Design a protein around this ligand. Structure first.
Ligand code: HEM
Ligand code: HEM
Ligand code: HEM
Ligand code: HEM
Ligand SMILES: C/C=C(C)/C=C/C=C/[C@H](OC)[C@@H](C)[C@@H](OC)[C@@H](C)CCc1oc2c(O)c(OC)cc(OC)c2c(=O)c1C
Ligand SMILES: C/C=C(C)/C=C/C=C/[C@H](OC)[C@@H](C)[C@@H](OC)[C@@H](C)CCc1oc2c(O)c(OC)cc(OC)c2c(=O)c1C
Ligand SMILES: CCCCCC(=O)OC[C@H](COP(=O)([O-])OCCN)OC(=O)CCCCC
Ligand SMILES: CCCCCCCCO[C@@H]1O[C@H](CO)[C@@H](O)[C@H](O)[C@H]1O
Ligand SMILES: CCCCCCCCO[C@@H]1O[C@H](CO)[C@@H](O)[C@H](O)[C@H]1O
Ligand code: FES
Ligand code: FES
Ligand SMILES: [Sr+2]
Lengths: 428, 179, 256, 428, 256, 179
């Protein structure tokens, strides 16, 4: 896509292979892509996510060599890993805390894109592929959390399969089909294990298209100004090759991220966990302090904010003749919050790519970022006053940002002029 | 004419049917297996239950609550008017489907002492906490904050309906047959 | 329910350089066997782990003698026999006494502020502090609001938060007034209930801290190994990060 | 790199998508590759193999929702599938017999290549990738057979892990590492399940490279004469586009193959199985009639043919000062039989591609095909006289074919003239 | 050991259109309950499957009454109770009596010729034929070579091939001369040992075939469903193959 | 000069060490876990074993054969000369590692009645069939056709060595301690 020099076989082994299968040529053109010179530290989270996916897979596969997906043995088999398997305690904590690191990385990755307009044309496909990866990660992470068969494991599985029971008409059928019976039991544990194994490979396939997508268009940069393509001379002044300049910066950033991550795993591996999952699943009692995994809290807070008392719920119930009650409304709101984020390329009507040059946009974006942290915090609180209102106000702003502010902003805002080229911004 | 056009349809149509016949068993294998569908009934010994105690029992892989209600519980339940309930249906398998959610239609006996119901929150399936919990002297579901009253009727929160009452009847003075 | 106050005990194993005190773990094992074991089991702890490094590290002959006291039903034979080190501790003898294998990790003593989690970030989860607080938090007189309303078979504990509470101990919104609530566990400890061989003091304070440390090891037997790995990974990644910084810096010099 | 016409976006959705992610362009240029007109019915086994991998994966994932990898529960959980799970009996038999169909297809696939010289230059990479897939299939199929935990399951796992114990010096360490203990127990079952799940995805990844390899060079054809590449005019006289002409022909052949396959599974699902695997694993006794899965028999016959009495074994032991005894010799011979087949592009020194025009080659090739059937048959017989000799003669010819006949044949044979072009052969 | 000759019984369930005889399976169940059950179990067969379609299809009330005769140890309670339809048949009462759940598939009665497997391709695996042959193959007189060398507690059987054999019954190379060998199972059948309600004959021949059919269903309860699926799949792919043939042919017409 | 050349070596060297430290625990987790390494000893009651009977017992997840040999078995074993054996080492953990495979050095007692050994074929681990099987009045392994004699010594087939004899000794008249 970008003008650049191509591969040429030099060794006799290379000349032989290149004339049969140009796999070395493909690795060369991939790793040597001209990348904008002016990428800042927010462009590292792609490599961090890639490492996480590899970390989870290899630690996951290893854990599966010692784990038993059976209700009488699942919890005991995890303690067998922790106590008896060579290094099992560390591999378990790496897989568990690795999921947390995985989700810290996506949220920074996503909000980076939302700020710099990395979802705007010609990058819609990259964004949509990203959203599919994100759904798979959550579904994958959900099923992983069920496997230890603790109290949070068992009752989270009941609730999350219950979401599908809220669908009118067919909901109860889908729920029984997912459950394999009337209630969460052994049949559910066995199938979640198989699907927890499968989905990371589907994520890997999506990541390949994800990587293919932004290689076709080229990486965005903080200015939103595209690389000049009229000649190799000025394309090279806007860019440097990905390897070595940006490989090493990413590997460096990764080493710092992993330095912190291994300190957590080594010295506070349970901080981001829920203590109640060290209690064996008891199907006859729900813990009083049940709370989702922290990376689920914003969407959990959104779902439970919409009770029967909420005015908009009562309108929905009336207009829908009772079909959309508080139960189904909250499920729609939760999945709807994810859907509107997927539709953001067609809701943001501004032609300016980078939010750096959009004065009004900056205000509402940082409110959304603050809102996301707030949503995480209220998710762990009780549903009493004032948290019930904080979650309604927070939920309201999330939908308003994508559905109201962004369409309106693109037809009112007066943006500042961006630089002429990437080179100008880099030298500055 | 349309003679060679029909072959390309008939071939594709047969392929679609063949695919569908192959996809359905891949879906239907996740539906309840024969050991699960072989639903079974149980008997609960009740001689040890004093008033104010809730017994929680497993039935078909889910909890069933058998509470011997106190005098206060019964009085509160009968004092609620129909128009004050979120869900006015009795949700009671033992009587007519259209029965009203009066406290009388929520118990197995006429005296209203024995409240038997699924201990499964009608929102998303968590198990509400009893022992006179919540804001209506009944049950509180800690998952998203549903409050049930002393007859198990939904009063507050996301849950749309009263806790369902299974088929249950006293076989003798001290034994209830569930299912 | 909610969170509450725990006594901030200074356990040896706390801090990045914290490690188990071998003699303390041995005292805690004696307390568990002589007191707690009457009701509580540890079905996930192999008896042989008392010899493993990073724990009480008892000689293998002592552990073999210790395993003898348990009567285990052999799986193949089906007949009773003496315990071996390869057996786990028995299940709880008392049906409603929870298993203590993972208790020191399945309870959090530090909460908030306003459910932000900053307290746990600096003070830890606080499981062994909680256990200590329960063993310590049995007062001789209950709170004034329940002088004639104590449920029979239950006991007031300052730190226990998940128990029932009399109607006279709730405010106008039904929230409990007392710092704690009523627990079904009778006070298990009492001054000099255990006779330590080396003459160590067996006050309720000492035994509660000793047995809390033992229950922390039973939950996290590999605690010391985990930190060693953490240090190693951190030193590796510190060196590697520095080297990667200089490489990245010396590379971009010929660009900017 | 055959001359052909390229993709052009037509729909508005295609113009939109093509400028962001050219995945439709890639599928078009892939599915419309000009393929030689003269491919015969021996070119279908590639598509059959592709179907099998998909069949095994989807039936595998489904079976994995109900199977428990634990020695106390594995066998019972398989009977639960057979008796209780909706359609479970059919999904189990499809997965088991599907492995047999998978291996029938590779052997025809391999011998097709061996006859027509599809391994000769420029197709070396395709052949080696095929060989890697073949090794992965055997390892995958081996671990699958262990999962039911029958008598054949248990003792096959003991024997096959024992192969690695025969390596001097390091053999016992590797064997203990594979076993997870001194002998075959639960630790082995748990890890074989995880690896049985993983490897089919590696095969799928290898198949993608496999497909990439012969798309770069273009398919071989029965004449061994390459497509003319000097112009589109004469490239089209030698070829027709893959879709529809060869898609429909492959789907047709597949429908006929699956018709037969489903008759076996429906009416004689246990014919290709061993009845002793319906007996629970007994670690204290080996069945008298233990025999490998039929697709392993030729290599099993080779391994056990080399006893302490065999003369060439006795030479190896003397020259190697006892290092190479009958035990290790048989393992080398077994893996060596596979290795010499991987090296056949560099041992066949004849420049004539297709064996159709090699008169002497035909004789020795069909002896190898007969030898392969013979090797399969003796594998199921006892080790008494005469079967012990039949397996020595059969084993000897396998190595002679690759190491002696084929090098010699390329410097002696007088080949027949092939056609001038693919078009000439097709019109005839 | 080796393979051997089995009596080629014409079972109703053989052939692509073969199906179980409902009354025969019921008779075989009666034989199993009154004779075989004393020693043999069927730990993988759920008792409730006697009602399922494609088997004996007993009314569900009868099966509930049938389950009562078994004494099952409840898992939670641990105390004995009456059997339910949801329970499996018991384990073998006799420790060395193998489980019969899958016997009709875990034995092959047809072998060869010369280990080519063509016999099984046309006659089936022959498990129920083998079972039938064992029940039938108890002769009143042993082979002449073992007139005074029979092991005590064992019995000569014509079809059993895995048993021991006296030294006087082996050839110069140690291979056994007798068609069969000595089995630890005493002859279980005898003329009119079972009283069928409908007056069906209960000769050793009939009972051996009846119980062999019952043991085939217990091993492959979904046999009839599997064949129905085969017919359906075969008819689908036959039509599809024909349609795909005409499509492929009519396409290449404009090429050759 | 050579100042930035040493950094690129030191950096890569540090990366290599860090990688190795990460790969090793992924390999070592498949090695025997602590429950497996906690090897245990057992005792076998032997009062019920008559001559000509082989008792097969599980020990460390594998079979151990305890055969009370008959008169014929003992005589046959002592009649074999050393030069006729495939493997001339006793393979006996209870005596010197270099001891010869005489029948006396293959039994626990001097009378040679008690043959205790691992029932694990030394070829590829199958369990040989006893009861005086094979061509040498001993055991026959059905997996690839190894024949052992009345002392468990390999005589024919692919197996390279005699069946190993574990640490075993009579604790009293009727009990053997294995290990
Ligand atoms: C496992 C999960 C993911 C992985 C491994 C991954 C990987 C990457 C990588 C390596 C890059 C290039 C470097 C960078 O910009 O950080 C990138 C860019 C990007 N990703 Fe992701 N990503 C993941 C998830 C997501 C998600 C969830 C979204 C959005 C919902 C997303 C949207 C984007 C966008 C918009 C870009 C910028 C592309 C450009 O600049 O042209 N990704 N991703
Ligand atoms: C994106 C990739 C993955 C994510 C986000 C993920 C997430 C998780 C999480 C959060 C848990 C719970 C851990 C705990 O409760 O302490 C878990 C458990 C588990 N996962 Fe994964 N996982 C991934 C990939 C895999 C893969 C590929 C496997 C392959 C076998 C696997 C196997 C397991 C097993 C066996 C467990 C139970 C043991 C344990 O709890 O640590 N995981 N997973
Ligand atoms: C899962 C296993 C396999 C799959 C799905 C597969 C698939 C295919 C397909 C679809 C083709 C093109 C059509 C054809 O020529 O039949 C092909 C070609 C070929 N494959 Fe495979 N194959 C597999 C295994 C193997 C193995 C085991 C070998 C060799 C040891 C091999 C070597 C070849 C060769 C030599 C060709 C011919 C390429 C050409 O004509 O240029 N493949 N394969
Ligand atoms: C190339 C791909 C595969 C091959 C050749 C293969 C082969 C086999 C074979 C021969 C068996 C023994 C079946 C029997 O004894 O009846 C088996 C068992 C099994 N396999 Fe696979 N398999 C493949 C892929 C998979 C995958 C991807 C999964 C899981 C996602 C899977 C899951 C299972 C399970 C659960 C069993 C035990 C149930 C049974 O025995 O039918 N397989 N496999
Ligand atoms: C076979 C695979 C299946 C059926 C996969 C289904 C996947 C569904 C979604 O992922 C795509 C889902 C995970 C995702 O919804 C968008 C999350 C944000 C759901 C958030 C979530 O979590 C909870 C949780 O974790 C709990 O644990 C202790 C308990 C919970 O109740 C209190 C919840 C809960 O109330 C909610 C709303
Ligand atoms: C974690 C994964 C691991 C360690 C995978 C290892 C894979 C090794 C090879 O695959 C690449 C191996 C399968 C392949 O050797 C080339 C086969 C031809 C092995 C053939 C084989 O089968 C047997 C078998 O099936 C049995 O069952 C009843 C029993 C057996 O004894 C009698 C054998 C046997 O004696 C041999 C040699
Ligand atoms: C294990 C079998 C391996 C066969 C491999 C192969 O390529 O077959 C060679 C011949 C091709 O026939 P031809 O081009 O010599 O032309 C002459 C054709 N009559 O193929 C056939 O004879 C096709 C059917 C073979 C099935 C066993
Ligand atoms: C980037 C480096 C981050 C270092 C994080 C160190 C966090 C130490 O955390 C401490 O760990 C102790 C032992 O695990 C716990 O006992 C303490 O409660 C906890 O505060
Ligand atoms: C393409 C058409 C192939 C038809 C193959 C039919 C194979 C029928 O096979 C028959 O199946 C019966 C059903 O159990 C077995 O009882 C018989 O032993 C077997 O010969
Ligand atoms: S699950 Fe009971 S209230 Fe939401
Ligand atoms: S395993 Fe005993 S002979 Fe090969
Ligand atoms: Sr402290």
């Amino acid at each position: 896509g970008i003008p650049h020099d191509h591969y040429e076989p030099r060794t006799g082994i290379e000349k032989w292979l290149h004339s049969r299968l140009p796999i070395v040529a493909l690795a060369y053109d991939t790793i040597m892509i001209p990348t904008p010179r002016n990428l800042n530290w927010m462009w590292i989270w792609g490599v961090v996510l890639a490492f996480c996916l590899v970390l989870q897979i290899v630690t996951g596969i290893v854990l599966a060599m010692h784990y038993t997906p059976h209700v009488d043995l699942a919890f005991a088999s995890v303690e067998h890993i922790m106590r008896n398997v060579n290094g099992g305690f560390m591999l378990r904590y790496l897989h568990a805390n690795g999921a947390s690191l995985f989700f810290i990385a996506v949220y920074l990755h996503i909000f980076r894109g939302l700020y710099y307009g990395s979802y705007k044309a010609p990058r819609e496909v990259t964004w949509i592929v990203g959203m599919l990866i994100y759904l798979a990660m959550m579904a994958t992470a959900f099923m992983g959390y069920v496997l230890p068969w603790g109290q949070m494991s068992f009752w989270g599985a009941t609730v999350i399969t219950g979401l599908f029971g809220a669908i009118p008409g067919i909901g109860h059928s889908i729920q029984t089909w997912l459950l394999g019976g009337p209630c969460v039991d052994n049949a559910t544990l066995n199938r979640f294990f198989s699907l927890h194994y499968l989905l990371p490979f589907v994520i890997a396939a999506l990541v390949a298209i994800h990587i293919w997508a932004f290689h076709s268009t080229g990486n965005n940069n903080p200015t939103g100004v595209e690389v000049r393509r009229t000649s190799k001379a000025e394309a090279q002044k806007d860019t440097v090759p990905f390897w070595p300049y940006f490989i090493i910066k990413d590997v460096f950033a990764l080493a710092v991220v992993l330095l912190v991550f291994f300190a957590i795993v080594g010295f506070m591996p349970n901080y981001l966990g829920h203590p109640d999952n060290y209690i064996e699943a008891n199907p006859l009692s729900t813990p009083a302090h049940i709370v989702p995994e922290w990376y689920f809290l914003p969407f959990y807070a959104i779902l439970r904010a919409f009770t029967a008392d909420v005015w908009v719920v009562q309108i929905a119930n009336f207009i829908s003749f009772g079909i959309i009650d508080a139960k189904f409304f909250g499920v729609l709101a939760m999945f709807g919050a994810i859907l509107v984020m997927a539709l953001v390329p067609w809701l943001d009507t501004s032609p300016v790519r980078s939010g750096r040059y959009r004065p009004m946009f900056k205000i509402y974006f940082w409110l959304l970022a603050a809102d996301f942290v707030i949503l995480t915090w209220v998710g762990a609180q009780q549903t009493t006053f004032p948290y019930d209102w904080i979650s309604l106000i927070a939920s309201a702003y999330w939908f308003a940002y994508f559905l109201v502010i962004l369409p309106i902003l693109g037809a009112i805002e007066k943006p500042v002029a961006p630089p002429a080229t990437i080179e100008e911004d880099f030298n500055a | 004419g349309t003679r060679r056009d029909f072959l390309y349809y008939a071939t594709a149509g047969a392929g679609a049917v063949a695919t569908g016949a192959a996809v359905w068993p891949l879906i239907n294998q996740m539906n309840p297996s024969a050991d699960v569908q072989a639903l079974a009934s149980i008997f609960v010994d009740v001689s040890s239950v004093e008033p104010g105690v809730q017994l929680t029992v497993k039935f078909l892989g889910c909890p069933i609550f058998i509470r011997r209600r106190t005098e206060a519980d019964i009085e509160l339940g009968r004092s609620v008017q129909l128009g004050q309930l979120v869900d006015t249906n009795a949700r009671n398998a033992n009587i007519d489907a259209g029965a009203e959610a009066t406290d009388q239609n929520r118990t197995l006996d006429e005296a209203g002492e024995w409240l038997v119901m699924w201990g499964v929150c009608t929102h998303l399936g968590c198990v509400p906490i009893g022992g006179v919990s919540g804001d209506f002297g009944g049950w509180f579901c800690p998952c998203h904050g549903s409050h049930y009253d002393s007859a198990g009727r939904i009063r507050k929160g996301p849950a749309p309906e009263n806790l369902p009452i299974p088929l249950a009847k006293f076989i003798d003075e001290t034994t209830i047959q569930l299912g | 329910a909610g969170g509450g106050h725990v006594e901030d005990v200074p356990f040896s194993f706390e801090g990045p350089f914290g490690t188990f005190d071998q003699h303390q773990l041995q005292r805690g094992l004696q307390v568990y066997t002589e007191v707690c074991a009457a009701c509580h089991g540890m079905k996930f702890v192999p008896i042989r782990s008392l010899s493993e490094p990073g724990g009480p590290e008892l000689p293998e002959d002592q552990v073999r003698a210790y395993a003898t006291q348990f009567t285990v039903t052999d799986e193949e034979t089906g007949e009773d026999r003496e315990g071996k080190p390869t057996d786990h501790f028995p299940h709880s003898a008392l049906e409603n006494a929870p298993d203590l294998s993972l208790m020191a990790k399945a309870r959090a003593g530090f909460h908030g502020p306003m459910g932000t989690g900053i307290s746990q970030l600096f003070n830890g989860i606080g499981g062994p502090e909680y256990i200590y607080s329960v063993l310590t938090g049995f007062p001789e007189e209950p709170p004034k609001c329940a002088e004639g309303h104590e449920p029979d078979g239950f006991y007031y504990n300052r730190a226990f938060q998940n128990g029932s509470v009399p109607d006279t101990c709730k405010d106008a919104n039904g929230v409990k007034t007392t710092a704690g609530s009523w627990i079904a566990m009778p006070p298990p400890l009492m001054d000099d209930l255990v006779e330590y061989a080396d003459g160590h003091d067996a006050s309720v304070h000492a035994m509660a801290e000793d047995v809390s440390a033992f229950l922390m090891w039973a939950a996290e037997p590999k605690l010391m190994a985990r930190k060693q790995a953490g240090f190693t990974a951190v030193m590796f990644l510190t060196v590697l990060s520095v080297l990667l910084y200089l490489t990245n810096k010396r590379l971009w010099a010929g660009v900017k």
